[PDB]
Amino acid sequence: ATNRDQESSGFAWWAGNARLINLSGKLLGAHVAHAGLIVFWAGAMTLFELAHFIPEKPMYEQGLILIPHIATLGWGVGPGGEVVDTFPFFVVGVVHLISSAVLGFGGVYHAIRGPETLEEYSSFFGYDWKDKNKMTTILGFHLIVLGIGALLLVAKAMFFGGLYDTWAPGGGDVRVITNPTLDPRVIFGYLLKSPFGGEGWIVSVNNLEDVVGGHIWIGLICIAGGIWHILTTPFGWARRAFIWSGEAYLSYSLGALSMMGFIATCFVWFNNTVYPSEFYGPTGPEASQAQAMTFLIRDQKLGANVGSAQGPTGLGKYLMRSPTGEIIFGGETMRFWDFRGPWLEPLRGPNGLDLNKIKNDIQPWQERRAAEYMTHAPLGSLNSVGGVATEINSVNFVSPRSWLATSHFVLAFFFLVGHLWHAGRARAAAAGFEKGIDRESEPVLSMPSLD
Amino acid sequence: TTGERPFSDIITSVRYWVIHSITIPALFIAGWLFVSTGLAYDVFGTPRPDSYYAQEQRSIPLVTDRFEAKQQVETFLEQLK
Amino acid sequence: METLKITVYIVVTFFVLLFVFGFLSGDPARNPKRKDLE
Amino acid sequence: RGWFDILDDWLKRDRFVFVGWSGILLFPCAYLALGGWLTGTTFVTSWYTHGLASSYLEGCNFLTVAVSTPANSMGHSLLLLWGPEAQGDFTRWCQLGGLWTFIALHGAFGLIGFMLRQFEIARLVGVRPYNAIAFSAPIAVFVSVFLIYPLGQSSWFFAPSFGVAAIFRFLLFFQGFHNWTLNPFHMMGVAGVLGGALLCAIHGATVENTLFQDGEGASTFRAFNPTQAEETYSMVTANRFWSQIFGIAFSNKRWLHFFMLFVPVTGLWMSAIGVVGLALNLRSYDFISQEIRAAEDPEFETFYTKNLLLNEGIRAWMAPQDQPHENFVFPEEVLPRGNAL
Amino acid sequence: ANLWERFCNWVTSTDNRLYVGWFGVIMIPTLLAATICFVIAFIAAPPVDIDGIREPVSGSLLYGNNIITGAVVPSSNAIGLHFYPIWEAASLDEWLYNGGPYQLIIFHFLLGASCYMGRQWELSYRLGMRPWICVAYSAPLASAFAVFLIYPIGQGSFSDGMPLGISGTFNFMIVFQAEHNILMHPFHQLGVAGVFGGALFCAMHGSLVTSSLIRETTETESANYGYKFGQEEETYNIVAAHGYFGRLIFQYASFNNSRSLHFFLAAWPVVGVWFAALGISTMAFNLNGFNFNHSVIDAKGNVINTWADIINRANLGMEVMHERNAHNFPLDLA
Amino acid sequence: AELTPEVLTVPLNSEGKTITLTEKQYLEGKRLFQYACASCHVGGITKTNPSLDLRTETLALATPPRDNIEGLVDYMKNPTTYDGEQEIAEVHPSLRSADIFPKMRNLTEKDLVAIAGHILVEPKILGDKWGGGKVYY
Ligand code: CLA
Ligand code: CLA
Ligand code: CLA
Ligand code: CLA
Ligand code: CLA
Ligand code: CLA
Ligand SMILES: CC1=C(/C=C/C(C)=C/C=C/C(C)=C/C=C/C=C(C)/C=C/C=C(C)/C=C/C2=C(C)CCCC2(C)C)C(C)(C)CCC1
Ligand SMILES: CC1=C(/C=C/C(C)=C/C=C/C(C)=C/C=C/C=C(C)/C=C/C=C(C)/C=C/C2=C(C)CCCC2(C)C)C(C)(C)CCC1
Ligand SMILES: CC1=C(/C=C/C(C)=C/C=C/C(C)=C/C=C/C=C(C)/C=C/C=C(C)/C=C/C2=C(C)CCCC2(C)C)C(C)(C)CCC1
Ligand SMILES: CCCCCCCCCCCCO[C@@H]1O[C@H](CO)[C@@H](O[C@H]2O[C@H](CO)[C@@H](O)[C@H](O)[C@H]2O)[C@H](O)[C@H]1O
Ligand SMILES: [Ca+2]
Ligand SMILES: [Cl-]
Ligand SMILES: [Cl-]
Ligand SMILES: [Cl-]
Ligand SMILES: [Fe+2]
């Protein structure tokens, strides 16, 4: 039983997987088996959601997070995001579940049956962490794989049905993308936008052309980069900047994933293009705006002139100006004037909300949508009591946006912590004092006093 | 050590489990029945779901007199017909 | 305000550059024990 | 070597659970406080004292069960089972809140018992009794909050009830009615608790990160021997690190650990003094200069006046259900409310 | 050596009275700017329209505040999450009315404290130390992020971020309870276990070590003089302290391993506070405390109040009174 | 106190006829009301127009009367403004507008009766809480 106790390995049971660092075969096993866990949950969770799914209820009233992902890809839904066929959901679930058996098979094999190290078995599959060439090669392989994935999204969008477009003219619908955005000024344009209000960095992408073109770019970039890293080896400056060891690489990736986690938190919280509100429920900004819209409509029906109605503070009760002058909804929702949504934009003119359009052009479907979104705001308790914290039990509801955002903030945080942990440790181990200070060679004792 | 038998010894011994595979379920069932027979309600004076209010009453039976409190509660209970 | 903005932009860029180039300047080697970490 | 000394012998035998003379006070009182809390939260109502459900039997969960205080009409009655109120009737006694005084009093004597235990074992083992001394802060908190505070008020009713949500209510009541956050004694309490937490964290982490390599393991816990004579971490390195990071550093270990005793203990004692004041409604509720200015000047606004508006809300909206003995009926039209909400 | 090499050697020097380092290169100016702006504002800033309703709140000393009431007031609700640096204002007077100082201060501070954490890693590396003190520091830091950045992002405005002042902090807490029932949230409860527990173990450790100090002094001098800085011998008898505590409870509830014990001392409050931060950071997206309002019902259907419902009444008072002129519609949706 | 046949006896129509609901009907009523209505009408109020509540007195002064089973079933088929003057199926869930309010598609006549019965019985249980809003929480 090689390296399977503290004495031989140096690692206690609670750090047991650290015993795998230089056992590439077993480590392979751990990784493949874990991939199997991921795929397993995707499939099983999908089948669970589908069993618990009532087609004529909004997805977001049913605690669904995966079916919305499938539906966004254009599978199983029609105009307005109405479910017209569940079978694609069923397929996604079943095929993932079946695939997890394969992955788990390979993982268990490599983990407790196969060659514990791969280097004597195969020079192709074996590796040394310190071998910069091989490391960048495997990195290359996987970059090519990722690019291929992004290109699969592109292919879905352009050649196999299209995507769900909440912005489609005449109403949200599945649409084939025929003219993806290829101009780098726009694509990287997003990358150089401020993350602050009214800008929102990449989180602000608001049309499917930009999304598809983005994935075209990312796909080519990843494939090119992958080839590049297969054919090259780190340059001198890189060599001198980094720690080259398993734990170091792990730490780099932990940093990356923490970053991605925070980004996804903001994506699901603000964006309603790749997270359509039809499936995920309205955003916080969206529901606040929707309340304003709802009472503007009600009161104006009762005969109120909403353009001239002065509220208690002196600001408009229904309508006011943004700090740069655009006409926007009044009350606290003044904070959310950067919100943009298919049900509100027809009332928007060049200077913002248009009073004539507001007076004459509001359709019943808009009233409906604003009422729906206002009454499904992403607020709710841990035991899934919908509404403000003072609300009485009655409505079983917490928004998918809340679930997704909170879960991924938590994970991104602990992953930042993990990055600090493993980076600090990788530095200490590479320098050789990760186990403590050498009593006979205590560095501070050879330093001059501070005073 | 302080002279007692190690817990590791005891709880992994056959005899321990011969004893406690009887005594633990016995206790569990006893408590179960303490609730299911309704005895708990009567021992502790806790209202059953139908004994918080009389049918058309909506006023809490709050105790308002220190020394005749006992009689107050008794009257309150009679008020459930 | 424009002079203020330009000034701050130049300052921030200066310090950021110091940070990056500094950590690029053989930092793993800047420890008491094993210096050869390239 | 007479009966007293034989008894002393037996009480002080080195067994799995040490007994001691102090054990005679401690174990029955601690056992009855814990058992009383569990009995009450499992089976006992608060219908007749508060108009509340408070047990598992009634449908409450871990967060919402409590052994609730007695009716306000009970005043500060000891509420003994054989007393003039319950008159020996166990069921009525439960319905009147007898378990509350039962738990508070047996709890108080159990705490005396435990601190006596700390003195006794310290004397027996030959150490200084600084652990007992430190435990005086828990005593001060329990006595000021569960005994002195309600004794200053109308009745045991306004003591904290023994339950999670019940305690949360106690907190919110103290904000609304006492403006307790404004109180400099509570603030010193906060500084002592948060500062205690900080010292706990920073000391533990510092020791763990200035360890000497005393073994070959990458898991470093085994490289310690309780019998060893050497420091297991470097105080000199620790001192240089914090000196260069924070400007100042401990250099004396004895002082370090005394300070760790001093900060949270002192914090809790100060908070106790504040609650003793709240027993008499002797609050730090207002700043008089603030109020004179704001009364005369309808444009003057600070976070202090904002928070009093919040307090006024808490009082008006919580009082009728929280204080049922008062029979409050606040018509809709008199409830303080901002626009729309 | 060239000028840049010399400069690097100085920056990363282990002999500076205060360590600079590359993180320090960012930390020092940002903390200085945050500090200076904070002090000037706290003394002299005019009233700030925090809630964007032209109702300016006075935070500074010169404008009617004391130490307890004063604050640097969060930026206007009108600004929301927009970036509002000095050069976005038409004038310093506009900047001040809209709460520019708040944004300048909290951004410079969040950056500076992040770099403080990094700097803790950096010096641990220069001194040949193990690296994880910075991880302990990540807990208070995460908390700061939670109340100054994450909660504002989630609610769509820096006007709902914590005020830089004592009473303002209490304001933040009370409105938080109204809108999230944070008290009934298990992550806040883990936070309380974290700091109550941290305090407890602080006092406990302190008292145990102090109680087992080895006699090295006379009764007319402080026992502290019995320890000398850098002595190799431990200054207390851990076997005696363990004998004591182990008898106080029972033997196997006590730590005989000092490393294990100090690791506990670090882990408990750090993890607890991590959960406090995550509690704020997730109520930032309105996943709130447990709601057991009207959860117990009798046979007819009458509501039987629990302590949770009383809590709910208090929260209602807070809700209906807070920001009394800012709401025009019945639901407070952020 | 109990959920008695008398509590569950509610006006069938405007002409003084009653109908006694079963306990299964009461439970179905609460379930269906939560399913199709509570998102706006939780506790007997109306979130998107708080001026109109589901109190029995309010429903009695509605046009046509809505304080009986027939009136409520009709409302769920063809909802009107309070004065009976406008049909509002286009902005209010109804069988007539099941196409745009899809949760109404699987509601049967039996379901409508149960929802109606819930709306009538619940104030008999909760009193002023029903339609009361936060003041009465
Ligand atoms: C996703 C989580 C995960 C994965 C994939 C692994 C994987 C691994 N661990 Mg780690 N570990 C984990 C979590 C995980 N661990 C956790 C949570 C802890 C703390 C409890 C540890 C503590 C730990 C220690 C202390 C050690 C390991 C070791 C190992 C390796 C060898 C295991 C072995 O030989 O046991 C043999 C086990 C058996 C013979 C029992 C059967 C195990 C199989 C895998 C069960 C498969 C069940 C599955 C349903 C079968 C499906 C079949 C179907 C597809 C046909 C292996 C690569 C060891 C190592 O590093 O060796 C060098 C080692 O010493 N682990
Ligand atoms: C891809 C992500 C990743 C990978 C591959 C690793 C890998 C490793 N970590 Mg790292 N780590 C990570 C992320 C990761 N970590 C994150 C996100 C954190 C922040 C918490 C850490 C913090 C951390 C510390 C402090 C340490 C490691 C250590 C290690 C090494 C041993 C781990 C082990 O055997 O644990 C065995 C597994 C366990 C003991 C199980 C832990 C139980 C968790 C906490 C329960 C989580 C609750 C769950 C999510 C929900 C409840 C479920 C329940 C109800 C059933 C191994 C190289 C050790 C090391 O330094 O080795 C060099 C070590 O001391 N990691
Ligand atoms: C990305 C993660 C994620 C998200 C956002 C969701 C979201 C949801 N799930 Mg899903 N699910 C997940 C992963 C996730 N799940 C996993 C891993 C499983 C397998 C256990 C499931 C299995 C599952 C089932 C069977 C069901 C759901 C349901 C739901 C819905 C209700 C959730 C609820 O009430 O939670 C309750 C909240 C909790 C239990 C709190 C969890 C708090 C954790 C333990 C804290 C962990 C902190 C950290 C990780 C620990 C680190 C330790 C530290 C020291 C380092 C909601 C949409 C329900 C639904 O409506 O389906 C239609 C439902 O029935 N989920
Ligand atoms: C994913 C990571 C991964 C890696 C790096 C390896 C690597 C290895 N495996 Mg393992 N294995 C894996 C996954 C992996 N396997 C899985 C998923 C299973 C279950 C089927 C197994 C079951 C398995 C067994 C039973 C054996 C190995 C063996 C080997 C060794 C010989 C490889 C060879 O020469 O094949 C030659 C390569 C080919 C014939 C080409 C493969 C064509 C592929 C599969 C087409 C599909 C490609 C596509 C990208 C798949 C995407 C999947 C993704 C969507 C999840 C090599 C070290 C052997 C060994 O260890 O001997 C001592 C061995 O006996 N593997
Ligand atoms: C998984 C993705 C991945 C990873 C881990 C790597 C890793 C690496 N790359 Mg590779 N690369 C990749 C994908 C990847 N690459 C792709 C897709 C391409 C095609 C575009 C390339 C093209 C490429 C080239 C041409 C080179 C590398 C090189 C390297 C090596 C050093 C790079 C470095 O120091 O980064 C650290 C990053 C920097 C030092 C950049 C400057 C620092 C600034 C301040 C970063 C600020 C970014 C900011 C925080 C991000 C916010 C958003 C932003 C848009 C505003 C390292 C092994 C170098 C090498 O040694 O090749 C052999 C090299 O010359 N890569
Ligand atoms: C040493 C452990 C201990 C201590 C300090 C206490 C203390 C208390 N108990 Mg608890 N109790 C205990 C163990 C203890 N109990 C045990 C083991 C049981 C299980 C039987 C109980 C069961 C119990 C119940 C059911 C109740 C209490 C109550 C009380 C409180 C009132 C007691 C009282 O007034 O006594 C008065 C008696 C003395 C102080 C004895 C002194 C005797 C003197 C010194 C000698 C002279 C006696 C004389 C010769 C007798 C002549 C009698 C003649 C006139 C007829 C007090 C806080 C009451 C309470 O909490 O109400 C809220 C209550 O109802 N206890
Ligand atoms: C290594 C290791 C580990 C881990 C492991 C793992 C992680 C594994 C995994 C594994 C896996 C991952 C597995 C999986 C499997 C799967 C399966 C086996 C499946 C099956 C399926 C089926 C059979 C289906 C069915 C169906 C259909 C088809 C239709 C629909 C419905 C149903 C569902 C019925 C541990 C930690 C223990 C430790 C030791 C070492
Ligand atoms: C898909 C898509 C898109 C696109 C995207 C893109 C195109 C992206 C890109 C991106 C990118 C392009 C990214 C990048 C990043 C980078 C990073 C993240 C970096 C990092 C770095 C580092 C980390 C470094 C560090 C350091 C320093 C600083 C100093 C020295 C040392 C060292 C090296 C350590 C859009 C939006 C249009 C739309 C949607 C879809
Ligand atoms: C009051 C009174 C008394 C006393 C009594 C007693 C002493 C009792 C006891 C009682 C008891 C002594 C009871 C107990 C109970 C217990 C229980 C009920 C438990 C439960 C548990 C659980 C539920 C668990 C949980 C958990 C945790 C804690 C953590 C881990 C995880 C888990 C979740 C598992 C006398 C007669 C003198 C007189 C009259 C008055
Ligand atoms: C916007 C961010 C900027 C991105 C810039 C990306 C640049 C990528 C290539 C960086 C080149 C690195 O170049 C780096 O700097 C100087 C160049 O004299 C060197 O100079 C350093 O050498 C040694 C290394 O031990 C140090 O002790 C010494 O203090 C210093 O002179 C570094 O060893 C070199 O690796
Ligand atoms: Ca290569
Ligand atoms: Cl307020
Ligand atoms: Cl509003
Ligand atoms: Cl009315
Ligand atoms: Fe210590």
Short mmCIF file of N, CA, C and O in Angstrom, two decimals, chain A residues 322-379:
data_model
loop_
_atom_site.label_atom_id
_atom_site.label_comp_id
_atom_site.label_asym_id
_atom_site.label_seq_id
_atom_site.Cartn_x
_atom_site.Cartn_y
_atom_site.Cartn_z
N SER A 322 -32.42 60.87 -14.51
CA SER A 322 -31.12 60.33 -14.10
C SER A 322 -30.11 61.47 -13.96
O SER A 322 -30.35 62.57 -14.49
N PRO A 323 -28.96 61.22 -13.29
CA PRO A 323 -28.00 62.33 -13.15
C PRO A 323 -27.51 62.90 -14.49
O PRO A 323 -27.00 64.02 -14.51
N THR A 324 -27.69 62.17 -15.60
CA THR A 324 -27.36 62.72 -16.91
C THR A 324 -28.60 63.09 -17.74
O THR A 324 -28.49 63.41 -18.92
N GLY A 325 -29.77 63.04 -17.11
CA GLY A 325 -30.95 63.63 -17.72
C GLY A 325 -32.02 62.71 -18.29
O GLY A 325 -33.16 63.15 -18.51
N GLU A 326 -31.67 61.46 -18.55
CA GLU A 326 -32.64 60.52 -19.11
C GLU A 326 -33.87 60.41 -18.22
O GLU A 326 -33.78 60.47 -16.98
N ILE A 327 -35.04 60.27 -18.84
CA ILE A 327 -36.25 60.06 -18.07
C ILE A 327 -36.27 58.61 -17.57
O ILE A 327 -36.10 57.67 -18.35
N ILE A 328 -36.46 58.46 -16.26
CA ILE A 328 -36.39 57.16 -15.58
C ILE A 328 -37.51 57.01 -14.54
O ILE A 328 -38.11 58.01 -14.12
N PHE A 329 -37.76 55.78 -14.10
CA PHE A 329 -38.76 55.52 -13.06
C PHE A 329 -38.34 56.10 -11.70
O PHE A 329 -37.19 55.98 -11.28
N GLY A 330 -39.30 56.71 -11.01
CA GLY A 330 -39.04 57.31 -9.71
C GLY A 330 -39.19 56.36 -8.53
O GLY A 330 -39.43 55.17 -8.72
N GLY A 331 -39.07 56.88 -7.32
CA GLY A 331 -39.00 56.05 -6.12
C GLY A 331 -37.61 55.45 -6.00
O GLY A 331 -36.69 55.86 -6.72
N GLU A 332 -37.44 54.46 -5.13
CA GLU A 332 -36.12 53.90 -4.86
C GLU A 332 -35.47 53.27 -6.11
O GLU A 332 -34.23 53.24 -6.26
N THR A 333 -36.32 52.82 -7.03
CA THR A 333 -35.84 52.17 -8.22
C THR A 333 -35.04 53.13 -9.10
O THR A 333 -34.50 52.71 -10.10
N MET A 334 -34.94 54.40 -8.73
CA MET A 334 -34.01 55.30 -9.42
C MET A 334 -32.62 54.66 -9.49
O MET A 334 -31.86 54.95 -10.41
N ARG A 335 -32.28 53.79 -8.54
CA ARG A 335 -30.94 53.16 -8.61
C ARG A 335 -30.77 52.21 -9.82
O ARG A 335 -29.65 51.96 -10.28
N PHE A 336 -31.88 51.71 -10.33
CA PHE A 336 -31.88 50.63 -11.32
C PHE A 336 -32.12 51.09 -12.76
O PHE A 336 -32.48 50.29 -13.61
N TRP A 337 -31.92 52.38 -13.04
CA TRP A 337 -32.30 52.93 -14.34
C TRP A 337 -31.47 52.37 -15.50
O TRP A 337 -31.78 52.61 -16.66
N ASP A 338 -30.41 51.63 -15.19
CA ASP A 338 -29.58 51.02 -16.23
C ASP A 338 -30.19 49.73 -16.74
O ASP A 338 -29.76 49.20 -17.77
N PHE A 339 -31.18 49.22 -16.00
CA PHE A 339 -31.94 48.06 -16.45
C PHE A 339 -32.44 48.25 -17.88
O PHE A 339 -32.85 49.34 -18.26
N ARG A 340 -32.39 47.17 -18.66
CA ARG A 340 -32.99 47.12 -20.00
C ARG A 340 -33.64 45.76 -20.18
O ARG A 340 -33.02 44.73 -19.87
N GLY A 341 -34.88 45.76 -20.67
CA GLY A 341 -35.63 44.53 -20.85
C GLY A 341 -36.68 44.66 -21.96
O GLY A 341 -37.24 45.73 -22.16
N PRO A 342 -36.95 43.55 -22.67
CA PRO A 342 -37.88 43.53 -23.80
C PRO A 342 -39.26 44.11 -23.49
O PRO A 342 -39.87 44.70 -24.39
N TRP A 343 -39.76 43.98 -22.27
CA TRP A 343 -41.09 44.51 -21.95
C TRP A 343 -41.10 46.02 -21.67
O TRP A 343 -42.16 46.65 -21.70
N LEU A 344 -39.94 46.61 -21.40
CA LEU A 344 -39.84 48.03 -21.08
C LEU A 344 -39.34 48.88 -22.26
O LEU A 344 -39.74 50.04 -22.41
N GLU A 345 -38.48 48.31 -23.10
CA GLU A 345 -37.83 49.08 -24.17
C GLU A 345 -38.80 49.75 -25.18
O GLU A 345 -38.49 50.82 -25.69
N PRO A 346 -39.97 49.13 -25.47
CA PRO A 346 -40.87 49.87 -26.37
C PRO A 346 -41.34 51.22 -25.83
O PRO A 346 -41.80 52.06 -26.61
N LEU A 347 -41.23 51.44 -24.52
CA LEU A 347 -41.60 52.74 -23.95
C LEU A 347 -40.41 53.71 -23.91
O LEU A 347 -40.54 54.87 -23.50
N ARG A 348 -39.24 53.24 -24.35
CA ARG A 348 -38.03 54.04 -24.27
C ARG A 348 -37.82 54.85 -25.54
O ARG A 348 -37.87 54.33 -26.64
N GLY A 349 -37.61 56.15 -25.36
CA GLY A 349 -37.29 57.03 -26.47
C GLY A 349 -35.85 57.49 -26.37
O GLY A 349 -35.11 57.05 -25.48
N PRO A 350 -35.43 58.39 -27.28
CA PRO A 350 -34.03 58.81 -27.27
C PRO A 350 -33.59 59.47 -25.95
O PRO A 350 -32.41 59.40 -25.61
N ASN A 351 -34.51 60.08 -25.21
CA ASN A 351 -34.18 60.71 -23.93
C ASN A 351 -34.59 59.87 -22.73
O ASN A 351 -34.62 60.37 -21.59
N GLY A 352 -34.90 58.60 -22.97
CA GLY A 352 -35.32 57.71 -21.90
C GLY A 352 -36.80 57.43 -22.03
O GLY A 352 -37.37 57.61 -23.12
N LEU A 353 -37.42 57.00 -20.93
CA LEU A 353 -38.85 56.73 -20.89
C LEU A 353 -39.62 57.89 -21.52
O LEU A 353 -39.42 59.06 -21.17
N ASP A 354 -40.47 57.56 -22.49
CA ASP A 354 -41.17 58.55 -23.28
C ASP A 354 -42.61 58.73 -22.80
O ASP A 354 -43.40 57.78 -22.80
N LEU A 355 -42.94 59.96 -22.41
CA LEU A 355 -44.22 60.25 -21.81
C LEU A 355 -45.40 59.98 -22.75
O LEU A 355 -46.44 59.49 -22.31
N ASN A 356 -45.25 60.28 -24.03
CA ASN A 356 -46.33 60.03 -24.98
C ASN A 356 -46.56 58.54 -25.16
O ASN A 356 -47.70 58.06 -25.20
N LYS A 357 -45.45 57.81 -25.26
CA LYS A 357 -45.50 56.36 -25.38
C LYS A 357 -46.13 55.78 -24.13
O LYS A 357 -46.90 54.83 -24.18
N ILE A 358 -45.80 56.37 -22.99
CA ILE A 358 -46.32 55.90 -21.72
C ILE A 358 -47.82 56.13 -21.65
O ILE A 358 -48.57 55.27 -21.18
N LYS A 359 -48.27 57.27 -22.18
CA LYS A 359 -49.67 57.65 -22.12
C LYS A 359 -50.54 56.86 -23.09
O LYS A 359 -51.70 56.57 -22.81
N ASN A 360 -49.97 56.51 -24.25
CA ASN A 360 -50.78 55.99 -25.34
C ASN A 360 -50.47 54.57 -25.80
O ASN A 360 -51.31 53.93 -26.41
N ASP A 361 -49.26 54.09 -25.51
CA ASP A 361 -48.78 52.89 -26.19
C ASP A 361 -48.56 51.67 -25.32
O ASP A 361 -48.12 50.64 -25.83
N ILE A 362 -48.85 51.74 -24.03
CA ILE A 362 -48.62 50.58 -23.17
C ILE A 362 -49.61 49.46 -23.49
O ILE A 362 -50.82 49.67 -23.42
N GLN A 363 -49.10 48.27 -23.84
CA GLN A 363 -49.96 47.12 -24.17
C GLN A 363 -50.30 46.27 -22.96
O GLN A 363 -49.56 46.25 -21.98
N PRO A 364 -51.42 45.53 -23.02
CA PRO A 364 -51.75 44.61 -21.93
C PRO A 364 -50.64 43.59 -21.62
O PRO A 364 -50.44 43.26 -20.44
N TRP A 365 -49.94 43.09 -22.64
CA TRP A 365 -48.89 42.11 -22.37
C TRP A 365 -47.80 42.73 -21.50
O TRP A 365 -47.19 42.05 -20.67
N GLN A 366 -47.58 44.03 -21.68
CA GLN A 366 -46.62 44.76 -20.84
C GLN A 366 -47.11 44.88 -19.42
O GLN A 366 -46.34 44.64 -18.49
N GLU A 367 -48.37 45.25 -19.22
CA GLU A 367 -48.92 45.27 -17.87
C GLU A 367 -48.74 43.90 -17.18
O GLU A 367 -48.28 43.84 -16.02
N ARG A 368 -49.07 42.83 -17.91
CA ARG A 368 -48.96 41.46 -17.41
C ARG A 368 -47.55 41.15 -16.98
O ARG A 368 -47.32 40.66 -15.89
N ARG A 369 -46.62 41.43 -17.89
CA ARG A 369 -45.23 41.12 -17.66
C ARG A 369 -44.69 41.90 -16.44
O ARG A 369 -44.04 41.32 -15.57
N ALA A 370 -44.98 43.19 -16.36
CA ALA A 370 -44.55 43.99 -15.21
C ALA A 370 -45.15 43.46 -13.89
O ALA A 370 -44.46 43.44 -12.86
N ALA A 371 -46.41 43.05 -13.92
CA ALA A 371 -47.05 42.51 -12.71
C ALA A 371 -46.40 41.17 -12.28
O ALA A 371 -46.07 40.95 -11.09
N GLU A 372 -46.18 40.31 -13.25
CA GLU A 372 -45.52 39.03 -13.04
C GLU A 372 -44.13 39.23 -12.41
O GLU A 372 -43.80 38.61 -11.38
N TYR A 373 -43.33 40.10 -13.03
CA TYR A 373 -41.96 40.30 -12.58
C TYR A 373 -41.90 40.98 -11.22
O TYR A 373 -41.09 40.61 -10.37
N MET A 374 -42.76 41.97 -11.01
CA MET A 374 -42.89 42.63 -9.71
C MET A 374 -43.24 41.63 -8.59
O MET A 374 -42.80 41.78 -7.44
N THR A 375 -44.07 40.63 -8.94
CA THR A 375 -44.56 39.69 -7.93
C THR A 375 -43.73 38.41 -7.91
O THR A 375 -44.08 37.45 -7.21
N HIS A 376 -42.65 38.40 -8.68
CA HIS A 376 -41.64 37.35 -8.57
C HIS A 376 -40.24 37.92 -8.42
O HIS A 376 -39.31 37.46 -9.08
N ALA A 377 -40.09 38.93 -7.57
CA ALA A 377 -38.80 39.56 -7.39
C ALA A 377 -37.88 38.56 -6.70
O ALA A 377 -38.35 37.70 -5.96
N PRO A 378 -36.57 38.64 -6.96
CA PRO A 378 -35.68 37.67 -6.30
C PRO A 378 -35.44 37.98 -4.82
O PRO A 378 -34.34 38.35 -4.41
N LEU A 379 -36.49 37.83 -4.01
CA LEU A 379 -36.41 37.97 -2.56
C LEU A 379 -37.11 36.77 -1.92
O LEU A 379 -38.18 36.38 -2.37
#
